[PDB]
Amino acid sequence: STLLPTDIVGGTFWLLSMALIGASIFFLLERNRVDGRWHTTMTLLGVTMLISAIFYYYVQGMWVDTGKAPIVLRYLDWILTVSMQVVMFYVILTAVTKVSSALFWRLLIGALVMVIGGFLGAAGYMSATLGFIIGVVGWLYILGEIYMGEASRCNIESGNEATHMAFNGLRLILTIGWAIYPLGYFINNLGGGVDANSLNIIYNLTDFLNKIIFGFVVYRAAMNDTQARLDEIKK
Amino acid sequence: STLLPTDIVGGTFWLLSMALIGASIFFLLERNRVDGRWHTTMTLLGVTMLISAIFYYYVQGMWVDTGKAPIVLRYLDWILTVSMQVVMFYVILTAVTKVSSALFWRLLIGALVMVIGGFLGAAGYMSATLGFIIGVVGWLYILGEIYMGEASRCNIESGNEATHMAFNGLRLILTIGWAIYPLGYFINNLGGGVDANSLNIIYNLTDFLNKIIFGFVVYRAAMNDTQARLDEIKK
Amino acid sequence: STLLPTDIVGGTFWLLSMALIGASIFFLLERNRVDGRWHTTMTLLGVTMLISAIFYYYVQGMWVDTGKAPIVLRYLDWILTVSMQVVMFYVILTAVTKVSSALFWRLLIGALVMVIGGFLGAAGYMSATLGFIIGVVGWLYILGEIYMGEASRCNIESGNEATHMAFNGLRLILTIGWAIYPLGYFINNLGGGVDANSLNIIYNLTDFLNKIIFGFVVYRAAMNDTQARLDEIKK
Amino acid sequence: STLLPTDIVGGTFWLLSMALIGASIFFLLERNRVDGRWHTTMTLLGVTMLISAIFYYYVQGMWVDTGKAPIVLRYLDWILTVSMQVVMFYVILTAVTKVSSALFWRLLIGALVMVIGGFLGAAGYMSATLGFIIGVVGWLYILGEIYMGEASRCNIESGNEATHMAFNGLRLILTIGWAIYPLGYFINNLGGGVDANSLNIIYNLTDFLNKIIFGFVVYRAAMNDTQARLDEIKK
Amino acid sequence: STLLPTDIVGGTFWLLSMALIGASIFFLLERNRVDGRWHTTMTLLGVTMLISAIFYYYVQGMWVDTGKAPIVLRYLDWILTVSMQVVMFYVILTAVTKVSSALFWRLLIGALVMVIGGFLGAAGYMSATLGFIIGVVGWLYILGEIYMGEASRCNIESGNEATHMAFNGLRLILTIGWAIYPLGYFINNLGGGVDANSLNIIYNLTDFLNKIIFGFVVYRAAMNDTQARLDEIKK
Numbered sequence A, B, C, D, E: 001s002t003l004l005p006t007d008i009v010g011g012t013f014w015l016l017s018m019a020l021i022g023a024s025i026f027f028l029l030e031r032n033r034v035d036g037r038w039h040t041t042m043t044l045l046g047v048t049m050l051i052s053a054i055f056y057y058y059v060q061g062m063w064v065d066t067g068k069a070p071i072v073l074r075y076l077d078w079i080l081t082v083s084m085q086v087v088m089f090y091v092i093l094t095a096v097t098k099v100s101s102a103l104f105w106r107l108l109i110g111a112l113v114m115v116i117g118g119f120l121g122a123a124g125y126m127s128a129t130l131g132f133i134i135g136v137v138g139w140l141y142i143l144g145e146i147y148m149g150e151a152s153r154c155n156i157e158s159g160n161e162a163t164h165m166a167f168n169g170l171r172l173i174l175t176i177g178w179a180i181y182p183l184g185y186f187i188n189n190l191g192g193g194v195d196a197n198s199l200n201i202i203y204n205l206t207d208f209l210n211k212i213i214f215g216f217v218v219y220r221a222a223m224n225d226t227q228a229r230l231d232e233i234k235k
């Protein structure tokens, strides 16, 4: 009776594909109902989800056919979608306040180091140790920016209550949620190893929570700020 | 001559895929004609149907190829779409009245227990008995909320005639319509068993009625309330 | 040289798929240019065509692979799209006048008896004779409604010239156009029999005319009424 | 290493598919920026291109698999898309002037005779000679209409400079551009014959020019007229 | 461990497909937020990305199946997408200033010579030398136009700060970014030769940067000019 991990692997790939195409359409359709200052935020949110959905459509095909789906495949999605998620901190701030363009590049370059540093270590192009180290340095920058950098100070000075809640929530996703992936990398590569079937499940589930909760956090910020403005217009 | 159950299984998978993509596009296109307070209701309705349509597209492929479509596959759709349907009670109330956000989480957690409780019992991760029990407890919460809870009291105090009709109708779907699935689980798992082909037909037909009637109930509420408002504007 | 019927079967399946996806997009894109009272009419028109297009996409796959496409497959499309076409008489009337909701259910139930009555006779679940009889009773109701029923009286009392033209045109499609299908059923089932290849061609061609002419009749009504109103606004 | 015609055949099928899906989206997205009188013109333009794109998607599949793509397959696209292109002369005139609806039917029937006349001769259902003759008679009508008929006189009396340019340009496409297809038919059927690999290239390239140049001619007319009106509003 | 080039080839085809469908949807959805004078610029930007995404969808299929993806396949995409990118210089200028239509044709013909000149040399229809020479002449025209031609003079006289930034940025892409492709051609054909696997990677990466950076440059111009206008309206 007990379903085999292999069964759960290709099931979760379907789940992820459906959930993310759903979230995508939902965020792209509700982009017309947020104040216009939030339109790019909502367009980037829906397109992030669409990109990830297309990844899972590709991967489910590779699983159905070949029966294998390596973990290095992820760095295609991540190179795209981690980048877009870290940029969301800038896009959200520009919605409500004025921030230097430099924040955009610090954040993006920080994401690119995290993913590329780990890819090089996973693909074999360099020691997985040096892969981990470069990846963690990339992360700790991003965290450094959003906790004690221009992004954090810009948040405080915005005065936007929506942007306060967004930041507090996205920062928590990027700190706890995103800590699964490094862990995975460590155990799989620098450690004993994990069956790829089992690591495909964990990554599939973590993606469900680190992409949906991210999306809903940002969507509530856009919807709450939109309403706040309408309520102040009424007064 | 007599078509074989196997024939009717893969036919109904097509029916369900066509009907649900049709209902999806219809609810997403008519979302621009309802009062704006009903836009999220209509966006969630169309995206629920799209998610289910994508499921049936996946499953029809598995059937066409392998010739088998297990009943545990359903919990991918259900984990997504049951959740969204139970949340519709909150989304509808927030359209017309003021309701605690806590209701959102009581309802969602209630759905997650129902589906996950049954998945664990169907996958083999726990006795199907304990699966049933946990599933039914999850349901009876949801029913408890919408019959004698904050959702029910908020409905009464809304004063919205549309929200009255919606509730009365959705409550009936969730009580009678949704009682097929537990029944299935009982007979298939805790009972003698069903032949999977037969249970795929029943579930395919029940999905047609528990997703279309749900959608049309909610669509009529949004369309009726929209008009009510226009008629009071004219006065 | 002479193309074989088998060649024309899979060709016509492509034709139908293209024509119906084309008509679908055209009716869904032109729904924004008709008076808003015609928006549901145009949304149902485009979604009817989309549902049929998806059917033909499925069937062309079955043909390309298996080389066979049974005639009982049609009742998937028909159960959906015949229902929607018979309801169009109600949706059009509610665009321009006030009609009882009962008409909706008389019409829908009439369609469901027609298709289901014939499915049961085609699938083998009952004598094809009793299938025919139940199917024809279902049709003759629908005709009875639209010729000498509430639908007919509501048309006369609407005073809408567009709704007069629509009715006259749709009632002619439902009387002459739709008489091919019963004929087919009779000859194939109650009669000697028809090669499925030949009957797939006839049904493919009849669908092209009974779905396009239907769509264009309804689209002209919506476009003509829209303009009539603008011309009276100018005066 | 000179690429083989077979290589160029399936390459050009891809080209055509991409170009036509691109033109389709472009015309359907720019339909919102033309004066509303041009909305049906632009909706028919985009849907013509979409229909042809879907054809080429089907055909590329047949090529990739079977390695053969007969030239009689074209008459599926042509029956749809030639009809729509000849009707564009009516749709454009009704945008800017008042024209009898009879022109619509003369033009459509003229197209249907051209394609069907040639199909019957290509499929084998009648002498290719009689196929050619019936096809050319159908064409020469259409040319007769647009050069010396109601379409030509309506153009002159419109006074629309955009409709003058469109007509002059579409007339040239229908006279020179469309003369490739008859030629092909003659050489392939009434003449010696052409390898279907070579005739698929010529037809693929001619479709690229007789569908893109057609589209851009019509799009410039809609965009030029839109602006002309805005410039006269400013004065 | 070290991933094989073959692995990276089909991975990058996925990346490119996802990134370009993402950029496409993003540019087509943000088309509604730029000043209307920028709507064609944004529609051409999104459709360029879509055309390239569809190419990579085709090519990934050819790789997955056949295991080979020749470098001559590229000229299908390039004939379309290079053309559209060189025309963007005209479309952008017409957004903000008055420019002769002749520039459109000089630019387009210049692109067509570049790609076709190289195709003829790659396909074998003429010496790769003469292919290179004709290709480089085509390029050097385009550069000549945009550096010291009507396009450059029109830019200077526009007075638009957005169009200044766009031009300077696109000119840099067309000069440095686009210099990789000629290099490839030279080394592969006129030179020693390169494994197609390696050249597929380089071209895949260069496309990611020469199509995204192009798109973001143009999008910033449209977004910056839109805002500049709003800011001057406020004053």
Ligand SMILES: *C/C=C(C)/C=C/C=C(C)/C=C/C1=C(C)CCCC1(C)C
Pocket (backbone or CB within 6 Å): A078, A081, A082, A085, A114, A115, A117, A118, A119, A131, A132, A134, A135, A136, A139, A178, A179, A181, A182, A185, A207, A210, A211
């Ligand atoms: C939607 C997918 C997401 C958010 C994935 C997140 C990925 C990371 C945070 C990866 C981090 C890594 C390190 C910090 C160490 C080196 C290995 C990585 C790339 C897995």
Ligand SMILES: *C/C=C(C)/C=C/C=C(C)/C=C/C1=C(C)CCCC1(C)C
Pocket (backbone or CB within 6 Å): B078, B081, B082, B085, B114, B115, B117, B118, B119, B131, B132, B134, B135, B136, B139, B178, B179, B181, B182, B185, B207, B210, B211
């Ligand atoms: C659109 C699909 C729907 C609404 C499915 C509904 C599913 C349920 C109501 C499932 C309920 C179950 C129990 C109450 C007991 C345990 C077994 C379940 C999960 C089938």
Ligand SMILES: *C/C=C(C)/C=C/C=C(C)/C=C/C1=C(C)CCCC1(C)C
Pocket (backbone or CB within 6 Å): C078, C081, C082, C085, C114, C115, C116, C117, C118, C119, C131, C132, C135, C136, C139, C178, C179, C181, C182, C185, C207, C210, C211
């Ligand atoms: C778009 C497809 C259409 C309109 C199909 C129409 C189908 C019918 C009118 C079927 C009628 C039948 C009878 C009246 C008796 C025998 C059984 C049927 C279902 C073929």
Ligand SMILES: *C/C=C(C)/C=C/C=C(C)/C=C/C1=C(C)CCCC1(C)C
Pocket (backbone or CB within 6 Å): D078, D081, D082, D085, D114, D115, D117, D118, D119, D131, D132, D134, D135, D136, D139, D178, D179, D181, D182, D185, D207, D210, D211
């Ligand atoms: C987009 C495709 C187009 C415009 C195809 C055009 C087709 C024709 C003009 C066909 C004409 C023919 C004749 C005039 C003679 C008989 C053979 C035909 C059908 C090829």
Ligand SMILES: *C/C=C(C)/C=C/C=C(C)/C=C/C1=C(C)CCCC1(C)C
Pocket (backbone or CB within 6 Å): E078, E081, E082, E085, E114, E115, E117, E118, E119, E131, E132, E134, E135, E136, E139, E178, E179, E181, E182, E185, E207, E210, E211
């Ligand atoms: C999005 C794809 C792009 C921008 C591709 C650019 C292609 C070129 C600039 C090709 C140029 C060539 C030459 C200048 C010499 C001959 C060979 C070519 C076609 C590769």
Ligand SMILES: CCCCCCCCCCCCCCCCCCCC
Pocket (backbone or CB within 6 Å): A040, A044, A079, A080, A083, A084, A087, A091, A094, E212
């Ligand atoms: C000034 C107002 C805010 C505008 C922000 C624009 C954000 C657009 C989306 C950014 C996408 C980032 C790149 C993601 C892909 C990975 C990196 C590719 C380039 C090297």
Ligand SMILES: CCCCCCCCCCCCCCCCCCCC
Pocket (backbone or CB within 6 Å): C040, C044, C079, C080, C083, C084, C087, C091, C094, C112
């Ligand atoms: C003013 C009263 C309401 C007028 C508009 C009603 C709109 C109904 C549009 C949807 C009709 C769907 C009915 C056909 C469903 C097809 C499948 C039925 C299978 C049982």
Ligand SMILES: CCCCCCCCCCCCCCCCCCCC
Pocket (backbone or CB within 6 Å): C212, D040, D044, D079, D080, D083, D084, D087, D091, D094, D108
């Ligand atoms: C004021 C009147 C304006 C009328 C506009 C009519 C628009 C018609 C658009 C659709 C034309 C379809 C032409 C036929 C398509 C192919 C079907 C014929 C048999 C192959």
Ligand SMILES: CCCCCCCCCCCCCCCCCCCC
Pocket (backbone or CB within 6 Å): E040, E044, E079, E080, E083, E084, E087, E091, E094, E108
């Ligand atoms: C063979 C290559 C085919 C594609 C090349 C052409 C693609 C771009 C054409 C569409 C955009 C033209 C828009 C013109 C806008 C300005 C018109 C001048 C008056 C303002």
